[PDB]
Each structure stands twice: as C-alpha cells, then as structure tokens.
Design a protein around this ligand. Structure first.
Ligand code: NAP
Ligand code: NAP
Ligand code: Q0R
Lengths: 287, 286
C-alpha cells in the first residue's frame, strides 16, 4: 500500500484514516483541531506538525473538508509548495467551484482530482460503497489503488465538474427524502408515535421507489408525459392531503407548502391531465 | 363469502370488485358513471339502479371515491338509508376529514371504518398487498374476513383517523423523493445526461435510505442529536451546493431554496453543531 497525506478529520476523514491504516498505508494526517487526530496517531498515523509539512510528506494529498473554500483557507499559505502534488479533494461543492479549485491547483503546479463519496463514514472501507471521480486520467489511474481502499472508484472523465455534478444529482434526492423522514417523524410525534414505530412502513415505502424510478425514467426520456399512468391533478390532491394533515397536527408545513406550490405550478402550466413527470419541464426553466 | 356493496368504480374500485367476484362474494355495484360497472356486471355483479338501492342492498358498503367530500355528495341524498350500515371508506384524506366523516356516518345511524390502501390497483387481491384500518373494532372485526379479500388488514386503533394518518406518514417521503428525482433529471438534462443515465445512481440512493432511517431512528427518539456522523452546518453547505448547482445550470431552484431555508432555520435556532436530524425539533408540534 502506498503512503499518503490526509487533511480534514471530520466524520468522513476519521473513517478514511482508520480504513487506510487498516490497509497498512503509511498515513500522515493533519487537522485544524489537532485533538481529532489523537486516535489515528495512536493507531500508527504520523501527525504532521503543520499543514505545509503534511503536504510535503507525500505526493498524494487527500482532503475531506466542508467545501472548496476550506481548501484555499488550508492550502493557501504554503501554496507555493504544491508543485508536483496530487490533491484528491473529496469535499462537496458545485461543478463551477470544483473547476475553480482545479484551476487554482494547476496554477500552483499541482493537479486536482475531484471526488464525491456517496457513503456515510461507517461505509468507508467497505466494497459496497462508491465514490465519483473526475479529473486528470493519468494521475487518477496512478493513485486508483490507494483510493480503492476507501471506496469503489467510478471515474467519470477529465472535467473535475463531473464528480461534483454526479454527487449533487444523487444528493438532491437524498436530502429531499431524509427531510421528508424528519417531516414524517414530526407528524408521528404529534400523534404519540415514535420514529421506531413508523420505521418499518417508512422503509417499505422508500424501498419500493426504484420500481417507480425505472417506470418513469423511460417515459421522461421519450419527452412525452401522458396522463395514462397518473394524473398530476390527483398528485396535487395527494400532496394537499399531506400538507393539511401536517397543519392539523400543529407540525411545521414549510416543506409541504413548497411541494404543493410546485404542483400548483404544474396545473398553472396546463398539466393537470398529464403525468406529474410533466413538471420536469417546469423544473428545466431557469429561476 | 359474505355479500357486500361497492360504490366508486375507478381503477381502484374496479380491482376490488374483481377481487371480490374472484373470491365468490355476492357483489352489488353502483357508480356515478354507470358504464364503469359494465365489465363487473357482465361478470355477475348486481347493478344497483340508484345509490339509494345500492346502500339498502347490503350491510357492508365499501367506498372507493376521491375524497370524503365525494362521500357527502354521493351519500347525502341517501343519508336516511345509512342506519345500521357499516361504511368502509377506502378513500384517502386527512385524519380530521376522516374523523368528521365518521361523525357524519354516526349521526345518520351508521358506523364508519376507514382504510388506507398502500398498493396500486394491480395490488388488490395480491397476497403481499396491505391496507391500514381504523375505526370501531367490533364493526371492523365483523367484516375483517371480507376486507382481507382485498389486502392484508392492518388494524391500527379505534380512532377513525389513524388509517389516514399512517397513509400520510409514508407519502411524505414518497413524494419528496419522487419530486427530487424530477429535480435530478432536470439537472442531468441541463448537463447532457438523460434519466436513463442517472437511473442507476438514483436507484442506489433510494435503496440505501433504510440504513439511514434506522440509523437516525433511535437517535431522534432519545433526543440524541450529536454530530458524530454529520454536522448540520456541513449539511447547510451541502444543500447550498445543490441550490447553486441548480442555479449555475439554469434550472429551477424553488424546492432547493425551500431545503436551504429549513437548514438555515436549524442554524438560526442554535443547532449548527448538532446532527441534521435535530431539525425535527423545529418541525415538531409545541
Ligand atoms: N458526513 C458525511 O456523512 C458525508 C459523506 C459524504 C460526503 N460528505 C462530504 O464530505 C465532506 C466532509 O464532511 P464531514 O461530515 O466529514 O465533516 P465536516 O463537518 O464538513 O468537517 C470536515 C473537516 O473540515 C474542516 N474544516 C471546515 N472548514 C474549515 C476551515 N475553514 N478551515 C480549516 N478546516 C476546516 C474541519 O476541521 P475541524 O476538525 O478543525 O473542525 C473538519 O476536519 C463534506 O464536504 C461533506 O459534504 C459528507
Ligand atoms: N389508484 C391508486 O394508485 C391508489 C393507491 C392507493 C389508494 N388510492 C386511493 O383510492 C381512491 C380511489 O382511487 P382511484 O384511482 O380509483 O380514484 P379515481 O380514479 O379518482 O376514482 C374516483 C371515483 O370516485 C367517484 N367520484 C368522485 N367524485 C364523486 C362525486 N362527487 N360523486 C360521486 N362519485 C364521485 C368517481 O366516479 P366516476 O366514475 O363517476 O367519475 C370514481 O368512481 C383515492 O382516494 C386514491 O387516493 C389510490
Ligand atoms: F451530508 C451527509 C450526511 C449524512 C449522510 C450522507 C451520505 C448519504 C449519501 C452521501 N453520503 C451525507
């Protein structure tokens, strides 16, 4: 196993450091809050005295930070010593800001590989986990085996904005679903029900969603949103029932209102008799 | 196989009527659009000439209409014939509209059992189909074996609105995830990808949700909102990245702004260093 540097020891960074040590990689770590490296150092990791020494310790530098602005904040002061470094940035950001980070790293002599890890910390090191990757192909294949200690690698191409784009595409569905979980848990609590009580029904509901994703993927791609499978106006009545159920129980309604608002736009565009998938045409319009 | 009356012959009522005839139930049907009963009547179902005759023909009356206002419009003129009837209303609506409907059926001598079917029409009669049920237990227990012809019966309690409540609880996440799929498709199309291209990743995303449902289940229930797996402030940046990715790609941001606004309410309430699950404290009833 190759040696490498890991900067950023939040929930994800902690998990990566433990999985890299599990594999036997000579690991050099650094974190702004130094205390978060203690457990990894006790397991055999080398604590870098500074972030510059961390970068200098290896060719491969992995970052697990909140966003790309934290990269400039951490790597900025000693950016002159980034020449010849391979910076694998596993932080979420937009495709535009991801490209900007790649441009900034190249201008200082390094090369940036963009990554988007699609698993929680407990998923690091497991082969069922995956992560999108885009950036320079040669530098990626040169460090793919080390990156495969963390997750499976899904290389998307040369443009660094690709991995960030793919990460956002899945996360917009994920946050929508999990905020609906909190919304469902809040409704259950107002009626004397726990998250553990609604867990089986909530899990069965989301587990059947792939069948509908497949059924509507083919239909959306033909560009025709016929109301033969479902009628948007019936979806409006359904989400309105959710909203009023929430309000009747005294539960916050901010997100149910936003859902109803989009259906009302679908009806305002004349899509009442078409499938609810027709709203993908409103969603493609700017603003 | 007890006889019963079925009113409401849309796609759901059609499947129930066929499933009942399959098992051998004596079926009286009526629909506002009378031609909808043609296939069921050719199969042996008795067509009632009026809604009054339909209600008077049996003790068990099953409704499969749009909402509970449709029950008032339909049964209102025949409200006298409701005395002694057991109305099993399988239409989806809010718990409160269900409770008002139960009081209305009680005011006219009957008793209402509410049902929340969690399967499409093609699931009716299938063994793995299920429906929530609420209302007076004795009236439900006397007709449970007939209702079990349609789906499995999941009795949830005496409160008539309980069946609708459980239906709504599952539907919050279903619509949130499905609408998010449309958002992902639109973002994908603005960047040269089709729904077929992001379908495998979208399927992985939703199929991995039950792990996160279990992970945050007992944490939310015990009030443990620690930031060992996630900090809310990190999620704020993440949903801000989605929002500006939508904006940069020139697609709609209405729901991404609504998601960002909720996260910022979490920070505003002092939860920035807690897990994102702590936002349930903001969504809860006083
Ligand atoms: N959490 C997840 O489950 C998960 C999974 C996949 C993707 N991601 C992405 O992975 C990244 C890491 O998230 P996370 O949850 O592991 O942790 P996080 O809470 O976002 O923090 C990660 C690290 O960023 C550092 N950091 C943030 N802002 C900084 C700044 N201005 N200057 C210096 N250091 C800064 C923190 O340093 P300190 O230790 O000093 O605070 C911390 O070590 C994010 O981009 C996230 O979207 C999250
Ligand atoms: N279909 C599903 O995927 C599904 C799954 C779960 C449960 N459900 C719930 O099951 C119920 C029925 O589903 P569906 O697809 O059959 O709905 P639908 O197609 O809208 O059927 C509505 C039925 O109610 C009748 N109706 C509506 N308004 C009326 C009024 N004012 N007076 C008299 N009759 C009236 C209609 O009669 P006409 O024929 O004369 O128009 C029709 O028979 C809904 O509440 C739905 O949410 C549906
Ligand atoms: F930001 C978070 C918080 C909890 C969790 C995750 C996951 C889910 C898919 C990508 N990794 C991200």
């Amino acid at each position: 196993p190759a040696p490498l540097t890991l900067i950023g020891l939040g929930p994800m960074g902690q998990a990566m450091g433990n999985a890299l040590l599990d594999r036997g990689h000579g690991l050099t770590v650094w974190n702004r809050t130094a205390s978060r490296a203690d457990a990894l150092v006790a397991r055999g990791a080398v604590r870098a005295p500074t972030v510059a020494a961390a970068v200098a310790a290896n060719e491969l530098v992995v970052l697990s930070l909140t966003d790309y602005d934290a990269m400039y904040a951490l790597l900025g002061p000693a950016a002159d010593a980034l020449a010849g470094k391979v910076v694998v940035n596993l932080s979420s950001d937009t495709p535009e800001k991801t490209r900007a980070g790649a441009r900034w790293i190249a201008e200082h002599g390094g090369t940036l590989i963009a990554g988007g890890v699609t698993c929680p910390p407990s998923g690091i090191g497991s082969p069922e986990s995956s992560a999108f990757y885009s950036g320079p192909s040669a530098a990626f294949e040169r460090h793919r085996e080390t990156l495969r200690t963390l997750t499976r690698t899904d290389y998307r191409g040369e443009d660094p904005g690709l991995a960030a784009l793919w990460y956002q595409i899945g996360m917009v569905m994920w946050w929508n679903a999990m905020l609906g979980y909190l919304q469902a848990v809040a409704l259950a609590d107002a009626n004397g029900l726990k998250a553990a009580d609604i867990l089986p029904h909530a899990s069965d509901t989301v587990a059947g969603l792939p069948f509908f994703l497949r059924f509507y993927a083919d239909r959306i791609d033909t560009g025709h949103h016929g109301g033969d499978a479902d009628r948007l106006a019936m979806g409006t009545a359904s989400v309105e029932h959710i909203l009023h159920t929430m309000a009747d129980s005294g539960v916050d309604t901010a997100l149910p209102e936003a859902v109803v608002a989009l259906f009302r736009r679908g009806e305002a565009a004349g899509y009442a008799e078409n499938s609810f998938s027709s709203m993908v045409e409103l969603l493609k319009k700017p603003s």
